[model samples]
Target chain A: LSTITTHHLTVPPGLTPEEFQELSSSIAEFHSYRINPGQCSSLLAQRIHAPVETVWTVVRRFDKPQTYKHFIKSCSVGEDFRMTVGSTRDVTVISGLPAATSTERLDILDDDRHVTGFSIIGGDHRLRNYRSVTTVHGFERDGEIWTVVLESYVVDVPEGNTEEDTRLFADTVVKLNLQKLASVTETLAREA
Target chain B: LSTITTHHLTVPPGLTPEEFQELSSSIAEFHSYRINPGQCSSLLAQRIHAPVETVWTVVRRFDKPQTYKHFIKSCSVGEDFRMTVGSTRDVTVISGLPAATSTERLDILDDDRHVTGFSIIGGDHRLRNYRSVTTVHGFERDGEIWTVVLESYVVDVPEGNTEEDTRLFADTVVKLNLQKLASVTETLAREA
Candidate 1:
């Protein structure tokens, strides 16, 4: 253990003893739209009781989404191909859902920030121009530390499907994926 | 500069030169149910291109969910009272939604791990027995870094409403809150 990493803490958690604070303003930016007419977007969040590094070990692998993503039945990265900004992976999903094979390109891969982003190029599924960004953070307070993962996505709704229906399906997949991520990450964290 | 914090990196970004490996087992655990027959649960994730500390500055404030949460019109936490495992907060929302006010209890707040968990105790709204857990993570890829927030929740379906309807509304609010979080956190990060 000749080399070690160290960091210090700030804000010490507990803040304020008593006071009422309305953190939102009447004229807010919340009432707005960023996506285009044909695209539907949604974001989801989850907190996992595990070390950041412990969970990152499972997420940063562009060739291994099956580690956390339940829908992925198979995946490939040219075997030993390096994961970078321009890399693309071939993925096949398990039955019971809609699609079979998906060809996705890696738009962003940042290990320093623990973030990964990708977009579907062409696939057997109906999702077109599907883009997703995933980030990881560490939470601390009351003598415990855990990891948080947030994934936001924008995709064009399939023709004949309502925006609500498209989102309902996309959201269901993302939600289940996060839960699985937590379970796998925690088991590894616990066993370690 | 005594007692300084320092750390090194692992995995070194690129992995393998060429090889294909299937990571998921056919006998999968994806098919399962942990929630009670009467409860509905879902998890959502998001990735914001910002530093973990920069975003945590906005999230760990139990007294200020209005910062990211769009539906909240007003909030209170006894002013200066410390936010702990059992502390509760008084919150009032705008008229667009069904609820006018919400009384919530904080169940977990771990600053080191950057996680916050809460449950709606009683509220003038459609959500009943709503429980939420939020976690933040850091995403690092290529040369960029970002943050990920995952918020998983469970709640009862309001009477007369279908599960799909309830989740649709709840998910809509969460999705917007996260987008706002990304926008606000990114702006702050850009400035500072």
Candidate 2:
């Protein structure tokens, strides 16, 4: 029931034309942009070769993003390790541009719907007003199950960097992470 | 590779002969026999009409057993609610035996294997040295997915109570819980 607009990124595999459209449109309207002026946002879509539940395990691991996101060098929870709403964690990044570490506060975690939302509060990264959400939607086509992972993020661009630069940075990092997540989940599902 | 010897309980649906054997044998080896001497434990095996992942979401929710087990009046987690090795909780039971409350300590929680091992540490009930384990095994038969829940608990029989009494008390309670779990997961899966 939603429209799919693109930001020059390829539409992910396994989505019906209408489903892709709705997801794209849904990502465009999150709360991150309201934090400040001159915000930059990006949405990356990909199809993972596993059941939606399988992919969601990786997505909902708020304390273990480095397990799937190769760019994260390490992650540690704050005060407590439980991944619930309002829990905070710090992540050290080894990849992507210039940022070495970031702290995130989990804002929403809906296991029934396979959605997680978090916002970056502190980090060595140049971006500010950073928020991200990832949602997995499962579909069965031709007797095989597939999940579509839609990740969207918004950040204020660093001084001297254009919105295009920020968008490119966020998009490429998440695209690679989704690819790794699909491969990891597919392997785990096969083992299960 | 495991042998399936039942203590007269029916074999749960969706498990292979070997899987059932392993589960049945696994239940016979917990630590519920030392409190008052000779005791009996029963394994309640049943097939849940939902995916393993769906059912596991309910099983791994260590802090929220009351959500599925209606006999539990309430539960309060100690030292935080995250289910991990050595965590403890107190549970209030409204309908089982004469005990109003019981304390339990988690011994093992294996997410990869979908197995949880716990022991009843303190309670007003006659049974002592109580230990229980529940494992979820997913299987596909006839093009439909199903989850096999294998529940086994052991408790020492107190004075004036026969082994049959303890077995009946433990068996009926968990069977109803499993039935509720299946119904709940089925509804959730349909909604998803």
Candidate 3:
């Protein structure tokens, strides 16, 4: 039987410390009220078939200079790869739109109240000054469920335009990366 | 301190019972596996000041006739306030396009695991079903965030071809209805 898991998340390079803090509190309050638009509230599911190590194989590759082209549709080997924290990279997106990139930092939490770590560091355009840690619950093996989460606030766009742009880019990346990852996973599955 | 709760879920309507089961399991597994897109996941958030009941009052009114008029921006109010699930209503949308509306059943599940019965119904045209859920998520406090979502999906297409005609209509109607809903929510919040 195959295992299940949720995807890793990226954030935009925006959101000041105060904004991030406010957004975090808003999220906290949102949960306390249990008042939501139903299904529209979950940003990621929890659980995983591939251990965090295997998923990281696909996720961590983006941090490397060579492999980004494999996952990011329009990013070629060199032309568009401007690797730097807080720097913007111009590239083509899976949605066939001009894309921007940013980077940020985060602190990751640990389960069992044990050890903690900074899960993701040096994000691309979609992630900057990002804050929000995720907790991975147990894996439902028979059911095939994997889940993880990463949340951040984009505060640069107080007017909401930057937030919209970040959202579009993030959406494109998620769909595109998932399609790519799934293809890789399927191939691996067939071989195994 | 405030609190918010979010439920990550999928509503695969028109699918057979078995298909739904399969899809549900598949999603749960993917979520567990860490292989799906976090961006594709839905989210619902609100402040602690706004309770669930406060939000629902605004949501329930979405079905009211006055709300419908605000949503169907171009539609002139007539003696007809009548609508039924699956019954198509012709109205001009914000895009200055003719839109058709139909009601579909909404499947709702509360935190108690008790399923409250409601519906999203259906649209008058064929393309409307492309996006899975109709009423994405309801909000309790002023629904500014929700309005942003509805407006983002709006695209301007020149009227002439049949599909363009249809797309324009769909976009306009959705935008207007969202606008109406937001207006009502604003009123409700002010009074509170």
Question: Could you give the interface RMSD of each candidate, to one decimal?
Answer: 13.0, 28.8, 12.6
**DockQ score for model 1, please?**
0.02
Cα lDDT tens digits, model 2, B1-192, are 323334434455545676666555444443122333466666677777788888888888878887777546579997546667888888875421233578888877888888887888997455577787887877775898777787777666666655655565566567667777888888888898
The CA-based lDDT of model 3 is what?
A: 0.32
Residue-level error in angstroms, candidate 3, position B106: 22
Winner on TM-score (1 vs 2): 2
Residue A64 of model 2 has an lDDT of 87
Cα lDDT tens digits, model 2, A43-150, are 667887788888898889999897788545578886647777999998875421233578889988989877798999987555566888888887766898777888
Global lDDT scores for all candidate models = 0.66, 0.69, 0.32
| Cα deviation of B109, candidate 3, in Å | 32
The runs of at least 3 residues in candidate 2 whose Cα sits more than 4 Å from the true structure, single-residue gaps closed, are A1-18, A21-37, A95-99, B1-192
Instruction: For candidate 1, write residues A5-116 as lDDT tens digits.
Output: 1101111112111100110110011111247676677666667999988888888878889888854657988866887888889987543223358899988777877878
**Any runs in candidate 1 off by more than 4 Å, and if so which?**
A1-34, A96-99, B1-192
Model 2 residue B145 distance off true place after TM-score fit, in angstroms: 40
Error of 1 at B74 (Å): 32
Query: If both were scored by TM-score, which would come out higher, candidate 2 or candidate 3?
Result: 2
